[PDB]
Design a protein around this ligand. Structure first.
Ligand SMILES: NC(=O)Nc1cc(-c2cccc(F)c2)sc1C(=O)N[C@H]1CCCNC1
Length: 274
């Protein structure tokens, strides 16, 4: 199902961080492109920790998810590297990296109309998954990649893409899920089998909170057991200073999954701002 790329066509360079049970690297891919021309393509190389190769089917399923469909806001997958004892995804390389990084570093420079722009693009991506009845399962600012930055001359907005969700929370071990509170919904903490489309509405609300808070991670001062108890007492996240989106956030982060608004409704809400 995955296109096969030979290890000798791939150079592994700098380390770009890690995900849950994964390492990610900037790489270079030599390939034949349109019109027969040879190219050196920057790629993202994503390697599943060999200590955790038992999650490999989830690893590769989460990727084929993003390539079932084609959409302008979904990161492209190029294939899998065929090299022996290893599990390596080859993906589009996004130059400006993760949204959470970019929010922390540019906290000052971001205004309400940049949040709103990014928030809209994300909602358009989620709307598109919605219509296809496709669950992402791991919406968060770190899984949003900045294709391009705002341009203060052309007035052109940033453009973001959504990364694949990684190993699924249906198989991940319980303390990973609990540390992912409050991106993981209450119903999924209670039972990961409760993964639904309404999962992504909650996480979207958490991601909007991240976007309005300049790289702050919600509930970060709270250890695991307190995160759990936050959900027992049915608390809501604090209103972000930039508070234009607090009501939308709370509306998405509804403890009742069936009451979370559709992304069509969310987009209307976002489009009704001055
Ligand atoms: N495709 C691509 O460029 N990805 C990509 C590019 C990143 C990046 C790009 C430029 C500079 C830099 F420091 C990092 S980070 C990242 C990524 O996908 N990170 C994972 C880590 C944890 C959760 N899943 C997101």
């Amino acid at each position: 199902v995955f296109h096969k790329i030979r290890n000798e066509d791939l150079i592994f360079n700098e380390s770009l961080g890690q995900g849950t049970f994964t390492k990610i690297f900037k790489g270079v891919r030599r390939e034949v492109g349109d019109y027969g021309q040879l190219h050196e393509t920057e790629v993202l190389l994503k390697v599943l920790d060999k200590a955790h190769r038992n999650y490999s089917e989830s690893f590769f399923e989460a990727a084929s998810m993003m390539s079932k469909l084609s959409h302008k806001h979904l990161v492209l997958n190029y294939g899998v590297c065929v090299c022996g004892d290893e599990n390596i995804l080859v993906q589009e390389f996004v130059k400006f990296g993760s949204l959470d990084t970019y929010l922390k570093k540019n906290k000052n420079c971001i205004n309400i109309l940049w949040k709103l722009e990014v928030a809209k693009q994300l909602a358009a991506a989620m709307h598109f998954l919605e219509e296809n009845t496709l669950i992402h399962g791991n919406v968060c600012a770190k899984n949003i990649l900045l294709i391009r930055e705002e341009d203060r001359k052309t007035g052109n907005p940033p453009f973001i893409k959504l990364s694949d969700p990684g190993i699924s929370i249906t198989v991940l071990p319980k303390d990973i899920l609990q540390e992912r509170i409050p991106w993981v919904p209450p119903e999924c903490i209670e039972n990961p089998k409760n993964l639904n489309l309404a999962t992504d509405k909650w996480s979207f609300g958490t991601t909007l909170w991240e976007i309005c808070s300049g790289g702050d991670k919600p509930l970060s001062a709270l250890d695991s057991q307190r995160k759990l108890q936050f959900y027992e007492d049915r608390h809501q996240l604090p209103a972000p200073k930039a508070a234009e989106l607090a009501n939308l956030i709370n509306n998405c982060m509804d403890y009742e999954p069936d009451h979370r608004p559709s992304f069509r409704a969310i987009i209307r809400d976002l489009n009704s701002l001055f």
